[PDB]
Amino acid sequence: GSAVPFHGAHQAGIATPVQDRLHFAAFDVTTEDRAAFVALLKEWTAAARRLTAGHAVGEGAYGGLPEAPPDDTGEALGLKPSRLTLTIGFGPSLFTRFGLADLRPEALADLPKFPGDNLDRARSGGDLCVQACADDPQVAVHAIRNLARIGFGKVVVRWSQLGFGKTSSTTPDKQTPRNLLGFKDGTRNIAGTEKDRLDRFVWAAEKDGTPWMTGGSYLVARRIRMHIETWDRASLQEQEDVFGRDKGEGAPVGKAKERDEPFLKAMKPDAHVRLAHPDSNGGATLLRRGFSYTDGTDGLGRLDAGLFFLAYQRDIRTGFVPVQRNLATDALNEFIQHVGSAVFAVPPGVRDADDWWGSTLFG
Amino acid sequence: SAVPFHGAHQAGIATPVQDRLHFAAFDVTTEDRAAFVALLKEWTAAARRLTAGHAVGEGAYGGLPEAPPDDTGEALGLKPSRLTLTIGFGPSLFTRFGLADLRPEALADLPKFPGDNLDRARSGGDLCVQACADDPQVAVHAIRNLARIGFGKVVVRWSQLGFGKTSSTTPDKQTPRNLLGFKDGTRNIAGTEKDRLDRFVWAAEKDGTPWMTGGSYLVARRIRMHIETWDRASLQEQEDVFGRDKGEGAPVGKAKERDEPFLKAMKPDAHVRLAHPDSNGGATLLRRGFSYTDGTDGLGRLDAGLFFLAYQRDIRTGFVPVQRNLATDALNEFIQHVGSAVFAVPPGVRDADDWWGSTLFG
Ligand code: HEM
Ligand code: HEM
Numbered sequence: 001g002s003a004v005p006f007h008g009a010h011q012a013g014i015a016t017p018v019q020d021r022l023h024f025a026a027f028d029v030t031t032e033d034r035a036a037f038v039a040l041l042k043e044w045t046a047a048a049r050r051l052t053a054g055h056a057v058g059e060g061a062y063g064g065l066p067e068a069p070p071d072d073t074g075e076a077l078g079l080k081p082s083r084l085t086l087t088i089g090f091g092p093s094l095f096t097r098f099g100l101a102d103l104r105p106e107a108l109a110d111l112p113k114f115p116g117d118n119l120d121r122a123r124s125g126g127d128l129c130v131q132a133c134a135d136d137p138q139v140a141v142h143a144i145r146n147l148a149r150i151g152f153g154k155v156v157v158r159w160s161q162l163g164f165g166k167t168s169s170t171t172p173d174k175q176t177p178r179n180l181l182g183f184k185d186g187t188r189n190i191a192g193t194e195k196d197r198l199d200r201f202v203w204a205a206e207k208d209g210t211p212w213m214t215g216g217s218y219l220v221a222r223r224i225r226m227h228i229e230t231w232d233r234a235s236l237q238e239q240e241d242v243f244g245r246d247k248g249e250g251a252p253v254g255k256a257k258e259r260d261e262p263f264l265k266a267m268k269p270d271a272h273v274r275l276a277h278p279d280s281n282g283g284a285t286l287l288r289r290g291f292s293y294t295d296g297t298d299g300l301g302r303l304d305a306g307l308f309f310l311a312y313q314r315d316i317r318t319g320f321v322p323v324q325r326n327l328a329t330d331a332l333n334e335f336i337q338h339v340g341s342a343v344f345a346v347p348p349g350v351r352d353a354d355d356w357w358g359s360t361l362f363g
Numbered sequence: 364s365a366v367p368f369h370g371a372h373q374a375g376i377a378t379p380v381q382d383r384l385h386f387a388a389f390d391v392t393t394e395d396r397a398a399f400v401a402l403l404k405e406w407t408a409a410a411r412r413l414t415a416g417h418a419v420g421e422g423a424y425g426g427l428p429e430a431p432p433d434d435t436g437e438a439l440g441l442k443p444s445r446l447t448l449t450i451g452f453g454p455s456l457f458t459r460f461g462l463a464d465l466r467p468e469a470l471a472d473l474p475k476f477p478g479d480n481l482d483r484a485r486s487g488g489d490l491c492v493q494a495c496a497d498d499p500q501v502a503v504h505a506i507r508n509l510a511r512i513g514f515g516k517v518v519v520r521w522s523q524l525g526f527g528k529t530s531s532t533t534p535d536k537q538t539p540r541n542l543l544g545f546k547d548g549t550r551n552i553a554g555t556e557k558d559r560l561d562r563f564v565w566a567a568e569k570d571g572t573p574w575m576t577g578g579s580y581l582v583a584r585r586i587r588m589h590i591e592t593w594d595r596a597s598l599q600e601q602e603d604v605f606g607r608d609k610g611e612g613a614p615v616g617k618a619k620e621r622d623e624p625f626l627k628a629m630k631p632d633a634h635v636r637l638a639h640p641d642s643n644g645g646a647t648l649l650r651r652g653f654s655y656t657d658g659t660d661g662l663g664r665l666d667a668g669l670f671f672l673a674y675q676r677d678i679r680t681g682f683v684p685v686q687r688n689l690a691t692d693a694l695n696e697f698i699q700h701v702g703s704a705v706f707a708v709p710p711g712v713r714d715a716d717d718w719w720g721s722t723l724f725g
Contacts, residue, residue: 001532025659061544062610066599073594074544074609080532122661136529137499141542141656145665149594156663162656164524165500175440178500180507182423182436232435232511237428247436248424294503294524295657299484301390301518303507 001080001135006052008349009215010203013085014287014312015192017171019133022163022291023140024221024308025148026091026126026342027155034098038362040154044088044147045356051143054081057150073149076142084134086143088357089219089344094127103361105210107218107315108345115328116337123159123223123340131219131310137162159340161223161308163291168310170287176250176258180226180292180305181335183243184250187258188277190287201285201319202312212360215348220320222309223293223340229302231335242331244271270331276323284322287312306339316343365443368414370711371577372565375447376649376674377554379535381495384525384653385502386583386670387510388453388488388704389517396460400724402516406450407718409512413505416443419512435511438504446496448505450719451581451706456489465723467572469580469677470707477690478699485521485585485702493581493672497530521702523585525653525670538612538620542654542667543593543697545605546612549620550639552649563647563681564674574722577710582682584671585655585702591664593697604693606633632693638685646684649674668698678705 004012031037047057050072058071095104130147132140141162148157167179169186176184190197199205204213231239240246244253244267252262252273267274278285290309298304313319327333347358366374393399409419420433457466492509494502503524510519527539538546552559561567566575593601602608606615606629614624614635629636640647650673657666675681689695709720 023656062598062608064598067597069595070544070598070601070609073590075540075542077540077544077610078533078537079529082529082532136532137526138529138540138654141667145542145590145594145667148665149591152591157659157665158663160659160665162524162658164503165498178437178439180435180437180503182432182439228507229514233431235429236424236426236432239432246424247432248439292500292503294522296485297519297522301520303387303510303519303522305503305507 001082003053003081004083004085006049006350007352007355009351010349011087011346013087013131013133014202014217014289014346015170015198016085017083017192018166018168018289019083019085020135020166021133021137021140022308023132023137023144023160024129024163025144025160026129026158027151028158029094029097029127029155031154032097036154037098040151041358041362042356043150045350047147047150048086048357049353051146052081052084052086054079057146073142073146076139079136079139082134082136082139084132084139084143087131087346089129089346090358090361091126091128091342091344093125097127100361103212105213105345107204107208107210107213107317108343109316109321111220111316111321111341111343112325114324114338116333118337118339119341120339125342126158128155129219129342129344161293163293163308165292167292167307168289170289172259179307180228181231181239183245183247184258186288187250190285197285201314202287204314208315213345213347217312217314217346218316218319219344219346220311220316221340221342222338223306224309225304225306225337225339227335227337228305241268242272242335244268244273268331270329272327272330272332275326275330281322281326284319286319286323312346364445365415366445366447368411368712369714371713372711373449373708375449375493375495376564376579376651376708377560378447379445379554380527380651381445381447382497382527382530383495383499383502384670385494385499385506385522386525387492387494387506387522388520389490389492389513390520391456391459391489391517393516394459396724398516399460402513403720403724404718405512406509407712409509410448410719411715413508414443414446414448416441419508435504435508437507438501441498441501444496444498444501446494446501446505449493449708451491451493451708452720452723453487453489453491453704453706455487459489462723465574467575467707469566469570469572469575469679470705471678471683473582473678473683473703473705476686476700478695480699480701481703482701487704488520490517491581491583491704491706499524499526523655523670525655527653541669542588542590542656543601544609545607546620548650549612552647559647563676564649566676570677575707575709579674579676579708580678580681581706581708582673582675582678583702583704584700585668586671587668587699587701589697589699590667603630604634604697606630606635630693632691634689634692634694637688637692643684643688646681648681648685674708
């Protein structure tokens with residue numbers, strides 16, 4: 001239930017070990033006052049420092065003036081930090097505001113349209129995002145609820161997503177979690193200890209073209225519905241052939257152990273792993289950081305479930321875009337549908353107690 | 364680690380409250396009584412496996428390559444996680460299989476309550492399965508696999524994910540808070556309270572329905588919270604709504620959470636004053652609910668609330684009087700009941716040969 005340090009060269013919640021739970025919110029900005037938006041960023045940063053240490057925001061959750069609404073809504077009283085991280089990103093639509101147009105990063109690329117997509121516009125996009133991850137869902141929900149509340153009048157929640165369980169790993173020494181298709185997801189990712197690979201594939205560098213984003217990263221989010229009925233009547237072999245790994249151990253086809261290296265020519269040519277692997281994509285590599293979701297039933301007698309896919313990369317054009325384009329013939333396509341999308345530029349870290357989210361962008 | 368599946372009573376009622384919930388209501392599609400009994404047996408066999416952390420059937424892998432796996436595999440590598448699976452039978456079930464005359468009188472339909480705004484699509488159901496565990500993926504895997512075993516005979520009508528505390532980092536003794544920020548569960552019925560369970564929770568044979576002896580009756584209410592309105596209320600306003608203070612959760616005028624309330628010190632329409640047994644002719648409930656958050660609604664606001672569950676020996680003498688007494692509750696400003704269902708939760712699976720519903724079906 002320990003704390004993850006909030007300050008750094010980088011924002012936490014990226015290279016950080018992946019926590020069990022997610023509460024992801026996309027916000028739209030409803031103020032045209034740049035000073036008022038800067039004030040909100042600083043208030044949010046102050047709140048995030050309290051939240052990530054397990055403390056109540058502002059003057060607390062009780063013991064103020066009886067006639068005042070409490071500054072903190074109280075539902076995380078008595079809980080631990082629970083490895084809460086709070087990661088902010090700026091969507092491309094933000095840059096149309098506050099005189100920011102010339103500061104939109106080129107690496108913050110709008111995605112192309114992909115075959116098969118049915119994107120819900122209402123649950124897509126956003127001027128900004130906050131990714132809350134924690135081992136306790138109440139802790140994550142408290143954090144989002146309180147940031148939204150602080151932002152009342154200046155931002156609104158466009159759309160949100162709860163992730164009930166992780167489907168990703170930045171810690172290859174630890175058990176790889178399974179997605180709702182029953183396969184381990186995150187075996188060949190990027191570990192938080194692999195500083196060279198993080199610098200190569202995840203962190204923006206000044207020389208890339210956008211100084212304010214040095215030490216930041218770029219995020220793609222995709223809400224991916226799973227066709228659970230269709231998958232569950234597939235044979236074991238068909239399932240394994242879809243991925244290129246066996247189900248129980250998660251080893252590449254033909255191999256004994258999960259972490260043995262793929263031999264891609266032994267996989268079907270439309271196997272997900274074969275198509276996704278960096279060696280199939282000119283070296284393109286991602287830090288995947290997604291979670292499973294369920295959002296009731298579909299009105300047709302079935303559970304509604306999926307995977308909320310999150311990828312961090314140094315440049316959207318060299319990371320998600322080439323990989324996803326290469327999945328055009330993926331065997332997995334028969335079992336999924338992308339139904340939500342958004343991109344964000346995730347700024348560098350909050351250096352110390354005097355810094356604030358977005359300071360390098362806004363000055 | 365694991366909670367025994369077998370007993371005089373189903374687990375998941377009196378047994379310790381786990382951190383997470385996946386509750387599903389099912390509608391029955393078969394008209395064939397024998398086919399439904401066969402499903403109850405297959406479900407019981409699966410539940411035995413699930414509650415011990417094992418995959419259903421022949422497993423999640425290693426079978427014949429050309430066969431779909433019996434278990435969908437998303438709980439491989441996880442723990443039993445104190446999973447309990449509790450089945451219940453809705454009033455609508457009894458219109459099937461010739462059962463009309465074995466519907467319990469204690470399984471009463473709820474009246475319309477003031478301020479109800481019930482979504483019929485997220486209300487009712489022929490059956491329910493309450494999956495409670497500390498790991499939400501364990502719960503969801505159970506429901507998903509039961510639904511898959513059932514497909515052809517039952518469908519999922521509605522489902523609800525929920526959460527309480529996270530017990531790895533939160534003391535078990537500690538009362539959880541709801542999303543209004545108040546402690547919720549201080550004055551309840553405990554699993555240790557064997558006599559209170561017999562008085563207020565378990566159906567007795569003498570009550571009129573022999574098949575239900577050792578069972579209980581369940582009321583589910585999906586209760587939306589008006590978070591943004593609540594969060595604009597003053598601290599005094601919030602405490603006045605409940606009759607307890609927010610930080611300690613002590614009754615007004617008292618020092619400690621567990622100090623017994625003086626009801627007359629609370630406002631007349633305070634929640635605790637209206638809900639207390641002394642205000643309801645002694646009517647007492649076993650509350651077993653969970654918070655939810657589904658998302659954002661369409662207007663920027665938080666789709667959050669309380670999935671309220673109450674167990675009782677008779678709906679007519681438990682939930683109905685208490686909820687009736689909340690007609691004037693100060694809390695009503697901040698909540699709305701948007702879903703509802705009732706179930707008759709049969710007695711326990713006695714041993715390895717028994718099956719869910721055996722006392723009803725014979
Ligand atoms: C519901 C959707 C998806 C499911 C169920 C899924 C499942 C999996 C599984 C089971 C693995 C193998 C274990 C591992 O992580 O190494 C894997 C690998 C991977 N996936 Fe996905 N995936 C999905 C979507 C995507 C998307 C949208 C992308 C990128 C656009 C992606 C990129 C990758 C990458 C890069 C690998 C590692 C390949 C390698 O280097 O060995 N996945 N996926
Ligand atoms: C969102 C809806 C609700 C919230 C936020 C809420 C909150 C609470 C809180 C904070 C308490 C005090 C602590 C405790 O003893 O548990 C309480 C007590 C109680 N509530 Fe509620 N509750 C809600 C709905 C209901 C409903 C629908 C009923 C029953 C029909 C109910 C029955 C009770 C009872 C019987 C008590 C204990 C009273 C006593 O014996 O002292 N509640 N509730």
